[PDB]
Each structure stands twice: as structure tokens, then as C-alpha cells.
Amino acid sequence: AVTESAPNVEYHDVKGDMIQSVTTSFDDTSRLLTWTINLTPRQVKSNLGALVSISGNQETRTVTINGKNAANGAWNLYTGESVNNNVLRITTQVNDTGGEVKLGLRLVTSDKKITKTNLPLEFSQVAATTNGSWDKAGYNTTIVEKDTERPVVNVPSEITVYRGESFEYFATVTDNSNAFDLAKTVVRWLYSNQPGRGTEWLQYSVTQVGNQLKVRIFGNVPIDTTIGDYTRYVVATDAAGNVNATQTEMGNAAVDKTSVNGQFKLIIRFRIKTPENTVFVNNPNQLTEVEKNLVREAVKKSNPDLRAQDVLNSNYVTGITVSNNGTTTITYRDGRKDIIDGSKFIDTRAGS
Ligand SMILES: [K+]
Ligand code: NA
């Protein structure tokens, strides 16, 4: 991008009679800065001289006067043609640090060739030296540092969602520049910029809050989706185009089974629903085998969406286990477990 503005005027000698306006143009890719100075000397004459000083974070690349390269004669002299509505353009390479950049000028016109020795630094000395128009001014502006640092995503290691339920999580994006490319900030699986096979219901949105992005990760999980886990990525881009994780890094991480910044495991779990009818037993803390089986059957009945394929080895008897004290362990097809206390649905028939 190119940014154009009018710099801060540090001083402009009120006896000066040349400078009308000064503008800057900065290319954020080349980091070249052009100072454009428009001149209307009262005495145009034949020769323009420009004594130029720049801050140490700049290095001069080009100086033109009236559209032609200036002859190169802390302060350096450049000379060229003198016309009305003359344009002096000083292009510098800004260093990677950027920051405050400064320009100082002492300008003259003359009918004679101009030399640095015979160049007046005050209005009162003009008549005996260059004997034409004169001006003196200083400017500054501020240039961003070159941003070579990637943005950082903060997202949980695991985002756990439940079949039949909605979810909402946030990832946060921070960058050293405090500026982003929202269009190139996404949540995706590895292969393409999409939510991914099996998780097509994964949604996201990107908002900027202050100096950070907030990436809302949300959706509605179907009752009929596969239980297990999926690797997904928050990929964020700063305003300079640096990304937290590149496509090639995502691919290496997928093969090596390592992590990149912004990676998360999306885990789809089952949400166990409690029996609506109390399971009556003799001693809720010392169940018989028949009572353990009543507990398993009640859990199956209240969870008709828990299919055999959803539990370990597609077997309800080994996938739903019930301890002596009525604790139910459900082990799913992915090896994940729920350990569920029976206190809220198992009761004694004594006193019922
Ligand atoms: K950055
Ligand atoms: Na933006």
C-alpha cells in the first residue's frame, strides 16, 4: 500500500519565499519515502539549489528537480533547473526500524551556478551570495517499523462440543503491529479453506476488539455425527501479510503429529441424559449384578441416540459398565470416557 499525507512543519522561515506545500508518499513494500516539495520562488532565475538533510534512519535514493535527476553537488547540495511551480522530490530508503523521519531544507535560486561554499543560511546573506529567492524549513513524519513478526493465536488446546448441543468458544489474535488482515483470518481443516469433512457444521466469525481479533468458533452439532476428534486450525494474518502458521507448516505438523500455533483438537462427545424414571434397587452403594444391568438398561433407554457404533467395540455390555457403588462408566468408540455418578437416578426401594 501507498500512504500519502502532509508532514508536520517544524519550522518555515517567515522571510522565505519559495516553499508552498510539502507532501509525503510512503510505499509500505519497498519502504521508500518520497518528500515532494512544491516551489514558487518570487525570483525564478536559472539555477535551483537545495541543501538537504535527512534523519539517520533514511538513506537517499533519488533527488529530482523539475522532473530531472538533480546534480549531486549532515547537509548535501542538489542542483537543477529553476521554474515556477517547480517540484523537488527526495526519495529515501527508510530503514527497518522506521520511526520519526526528518527532512531539513535550505533552498535558493540564482542566476549563477550554485556552490555549497556560497550558499546563504540566513536571509540577510542572500544578496551577497546567490542573490535570488531563498527558503528554509524542516519537516517530520512517522513511519511504521517493518513488521517481520507473525501474529499469535490464543486458542484452547481442545475445543469440546456435544452432539445435539450448540457451542461457542473464542480464539484471540494478537500482533506486534496491532493491525490485521481480517480477510485472511479463518478457521479451517488442513486441506482446504473449509470447516472440514465430518465437521461441516463448524462456524466462525472474526471481529476486531481494540488491538486484537476475536475469532468466535461456534455452531450446532448434529445428533448424527461421529464421536471422536479432529485437528483444526485458526490461521491469522497481520496487516503486513505474516501468518501464524503457513500451509506448509500445517502439513508438516499433520504428518509429524506436532503442533503449530493456532492448532486445536475439536472433540465431539456424547451428552448423557439421565433416566426420567428412578432405577430402584436395594442398596444404591452395593448393587447386585441384576441391578447393574437395570442401570445399564435405563441409561440406554434414556439415550436412544447412543448407538452401538458410538461405544467401544460396538458393545453396550462392555461399553457401559456399572460398578458396585452405582458408578456408570461409558467408554466411547474413540476410547474417551464418561464416569457418571448414580446418585441422582438410582434410589433404594426401602421407604419408597
Ligand atoms: K506482525
Ligand atoms: Na483491518
Residue numbers in the entry: 246 to 318, 326 to 604
From the paper:
The serine-rich repeat (SRR) glycoproteins of Gram-positive bacteria are an expanding family of microbial adhesins and virulence factors. Three of the SRR proteins (GspB of Streptococcus gordonii strain M99, Hsa of S. gordonii strain Challis, and SrpA of Streptococcus sanguinis strain SK36) bind human platelets through their interaction with glycocalicin, which is the carbohydrate-rich extracellular portion of the platelet membrane glycoprotein GPIbα. Among the best characterized of the SRR adhesins is GspB from S. gordonii, which has demonstrated binding affinity for the sialyl-T antigen carbohydrate decorating platelet glycoprotein GPIbα. Binding of these SRR adhesins to platelets is a high affinity process, with the interaction between GspB and glycocalicin having a KD of 2.38×10−8 M and appears to be a major factor in the pathogenesis of infective endocarditis, since the loss of GspB or Hsa expression results in a marked reduction in virulence.
